[PDB]
């Protein structure tokens, strides 16, 4: 009994604001995606594109324009935007456009705050964003420090993790695929090949955690680095052993038939591929940095660890790879921590109070 | 047993492009999509993509850039490509690039000729593009005419129909889905709401086709003309008789409970929708422009009729919709010429042997 | 005694805002240019350029950024913008970031009206720009009547005409340049070679002007339609009495030594080169369209006359062109008339009663 | 007696390749530009601009489509570009479009190299365009190491230094003008306020030569990180010492009522505005960075210095600035030096050789 209208890029945010959305039409809400690209088929779910057409093409104030007819057309009741540069600002337009007869929710992800509120040409942006929108919220604590800290917004922030569609990620086992591309241990990274996400160490630990077992390494992703990296697996010798898969998008399968997911990034509000990961009962271990902290618990479902301690990070995983005990045992914890406060059915009903709280 | 790149738009070209890949790739070949976007999981399937970062992002020299490192690292053997501008050019450099170890495939589809090939500052452009490539084709006969018309190019281009993936369009019926659309006769169109396609005649024929049959109309799409239309349903009365349903993506559904498909624009090189409907048993009723009339055989699969002609098109489908007999053929006829000279697996065999060919 | 920010695009809208701020300045007001590009050297002129670092580069959220950062920085009274999209919205956000302690002063002007105003996709996103600034003018009566017809906006809209910088164009004659291009009648038109400018009539009408009297054509500017009228003026074997000077800049001395000016476009709203043009002492023939009729009183100062009378034009201008007595009187009484109504310090003293006024 | 194109954006290669250009279109060449932007009149200059009209609007392609029918339709003998991004590789498209019947001259820069060529997804790209440019020159020895250093390409890369107009930068005084900006020493900077600028120690530095002289500092232009260093003259008690000036152009006549420059950049290849300066017989103290100690001698014509050396500056200066023999010698030696060895007609030249030669 609700009129949503989502905005998003279809990163992690498209995930998320995509699948909210999808949920959220489950619940018999009507859900009106206002976005230009391309996010079965429900009655209860519309898309509405910004079409553009002067010295670089307005796609902002097309966007703005959009919400506005969208807005007022469609009689929404809420506006859900998730990644604050352009869409805070966009909503607040389409916002004050329509007599502000309509409630503005923002959701805050990684690099809005994290490297954009960085930049001094956009910082009084953003914080206008977030205070003009009526409700905000983050997806890690730490997200809302970092606010805090670089921005500096007059609002409030409330914390709703991400989620993951469990009908989509179990423990299911592709044996079969393991033959498929050709092996007998697995460990599986997935990233955008930045150097934030620091790929070479995930390389130069499995060097190491590779002399005292026999294992592959599934580097899922393309990126600017995907060259050094590639150029370090090779004078390395470790060349036939690591599976650049390149860009993968259903990577529930890749997940399943692995056992062990390595993230050790310079930073991270999130994200998700741990949800997925543990989600499909594989331990991960990932660095201590801001947001990795508030979902593995270290030792319980999983590990933590300094950046740049790739000797750690093989020790560590060796370790847990013979243990069988131990492997069983973290990757049923983790799943079920999982289950238990990032359970997609329990995120989705947050949002759908913060909603009905807004009116 | 071959190597083979994609480059395509995830428009009409992005379906046709991604599809031949996803087949090409079941029959053992090795597919390599290299572009900048988002087109279940093949092991044999990688996806590259451009990355980009000067007055503006140098994405054509960047893609070129990726072709030629893709194309040398894998060892493609051909290089496909679906627009002509800008990916002829461009797959032009990489092969420059390479040595010229390499063979370009260029395939046209509509705009590219048809409006781009109109614009001089393109002109030249596109020729060179056709010129240079080791081997063209286009999806229509008319536009291979339309392509010697305006470009002029010294090459000869083969003529390969698109197709459509059976495996997705079906007779199937979604009675109970009619049911969560609120309906009881279906007319269904499918369009990017632009001037070309013209969908106020396709209002107008329908306000008439609704006076002697009762039937509801599906505006598939969202498009600039979306507002023009919305105001013509609206002083037309026919506006709780149209269910605009924006731009959808699983189109799939629809058409399979429909029965008569519309498609009266000034032009159109191919287009599949048509297919997909025909494919789904749906007699369509389209403008005699080139193109339309390499699908549509009048009275055997479908009818055709001049643009502007909404008077002609209303009673030719007023009469269709209760001859319950013709319905029936016809719908059986167009669905059976489509598996006829569109089936998927005998297209892409033509694309198959193209490539040995070049060799 | 005023500090007044100046937004534009360095076009049309480009020379009146880069000279209205320059004549300001000397009159003592301090003027902040914020505009990313390059419009002597004045102590009271500061230039603030946007930079900018995601889909599409934010240059207008980081122009709305700026524009508030220097507003309360320098802390200024009046922000003066140019085109309406985007700087209209761009200052209304700007205003709303800095508390609106600052006045929006909005110049409408042809395009921004004329063409966006008639994209459904800005339509509300201009109407809201006009709406929202504190004081909104145009150029001309014309396009005040455009305004109220395509955007249809609650506010009212003042009109102040463009002005032309007197100590840049006199009657001064390049008698020693006509040697340097090689010759002796001249006739002068310049544009930006596009389908409005209709600049197949302005040779249609030479080459008839040309059969009566020994004449050269200056064809000033460089656009699309460049080889469209290329190939006329050759297949029309005037070839050799046409001189395609590429788009120039400093065409003050090419008017100076011209005798006719032609400006036959479907429309304009105003548009200076016929001031120019007039105040070089040089008898325009321009279309009777929307905005030159407010510049050029037939026969007083000049000619008008319908849309695609090539015959028509020719005649009108055979027939000035050996009256000698009707050309020195005409020449004379134009830049007269402009002296009249569009004397520089006259209207940037409107401009400036604007500004006190809005406070 | 020759018929040249050039190519550039009108930073520090548009000066140059605009100037050049209007250098030898007074030596009775025939120059064409080739360029989307806005660079007296002559009339063998003519301006040729690129039109564009998808993905990401085709800027290279188009570029390389105008600089094609520019070529064979006016028959250009020479093609001379200027970045090497992207216009080399336009220049090659160009070439191979005409059937190779033209001449391209590469003449690399900064940036284009240093930043450009550091990233791996144009590295190919740059070596390509250089390998196949007919002759290629470079500013600077230091830019010529780099080069062969991060791009290896497989071609000879010659000297030739960029010039200034002397019709432009002479020892005129402005003494007139310093009583406009409020000021009695004076110590000029002019950057694009940019990180590897160093504009902080400029002001260090100068937050230390003023303590034991009474200077006011001009600060230049405009960039990113200018509000740290607004900052930083803010929190350092010299902030009505410092007249932010924001980006000026017309920079002749601020330099020349200057004592001092200051350049203290991590990285340069050249760059003029030390030759600006110096031309106006204002010595200058820049850092020891890869092409600077190719114009500045130290003690002869200025004085080098490692990079973050707030205090080694500082102490140079505050030297320099009271004893008036050797800073009237040292602005004499300057002033001399550079007429010796960046003499504008002796440069253009060069370039002039460059093109007969090159046939």
Redesign the interface.
């Known amino acids: 009994k609700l009129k949503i209208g989502i905005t998003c890029?279809?990163g992690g945010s498209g995930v998320v604001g995509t699948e909210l959305g999808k949920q959220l039409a489950e619940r018999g809400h009507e859900i009106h995606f206002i976005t230009s690209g391309?996010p079965?088929?429900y009655?209860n779910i519309?898309?509405?594109?910004?079409?553009?057409?002067?010295?670089?093409?307005?796609?902002?104030?097309?966007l703005?324009?959009?919400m506005?007819?969208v807005a007022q057309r469609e009689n929404l009741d809420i506006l859900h935007v998730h990644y604050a540069?352009?869409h805070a600002?966009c909503a607040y337009?389409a916002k004050?456009?329509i007599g502000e007869r309509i409630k503005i929710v923002t959701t805050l992800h990684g690099t809005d705050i994290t490297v954009l509120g960085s930049?001094?040409?956009?910082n009084?942006?953003i914080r206008?964003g977030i205070e003009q929108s009526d409700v905000v919220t983050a997806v890690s604590h730490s997200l809302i420090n970092e606010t805090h800290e670089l921005v500096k917004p007059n609002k409030d922030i409330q914390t709703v993790y991400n989620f993951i569609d469990e009908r989509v990620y179990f423990k299911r086992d592709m044996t079969q695929?393991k033959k498929?591309?050709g092996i007998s241990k697995i460990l599986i990274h997935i990233s955008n090949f930045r150097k934030v996400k620091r790929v070479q160490d995930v390389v130069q630990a499995f060097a190491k955690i590779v002399t005292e077992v026999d294992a592959k390494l599934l580097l899922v992703g393309?990126?600017?680095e995907f060259?050094?990296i590639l150029q370090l697996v090779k004078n390395l010798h470790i060349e036939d052993r690591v599976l650049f898969?390149?860009?993968?998008?259903?990577?529930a399968?890749?997940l399943a038939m692995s056992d062990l997911m390595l993230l050790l990034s310079e930073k991270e509000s999130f994200g998700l591929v741990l949800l997925e990961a543990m989600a499909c009962g594989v331990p991960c271990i990932g660095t201590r940095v801001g947001g990795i902290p508030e979902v593995i618990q270290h030792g319980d479902t999983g590990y933590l660890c300094e950046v740049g301690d790739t000797t750690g990070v093989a020790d560590q995983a060796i370790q847990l790879l013979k243990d069988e005990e131990l492997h069983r045992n973290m990757g049923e914890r983790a799943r079920e921590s999982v289950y238990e406060q990032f359970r997609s059915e329990k995120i989705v009903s947050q949002y759908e109070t913060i909603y009905y709280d807004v009116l």
Chains 1, 2, 3, 4 share one sequence.
């Not at 930049?119 to 956009?122: C, G, K």
């Not at 898969?245 to 990577?251: R, S």
């Open positions: 890029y279809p391309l079965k088929v009655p519309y898309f509405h594109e910004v079409t553009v057409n002067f010295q670089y093409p307005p796609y902002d104030l097309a703005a324009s959009k506005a007819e540069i352009p600002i337009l004050q456009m930049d001094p040409s956009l009084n942006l206008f695929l498929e591309y393309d990126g600017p060259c050094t898969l390149g860009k993968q998008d259903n990577v399968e890749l």
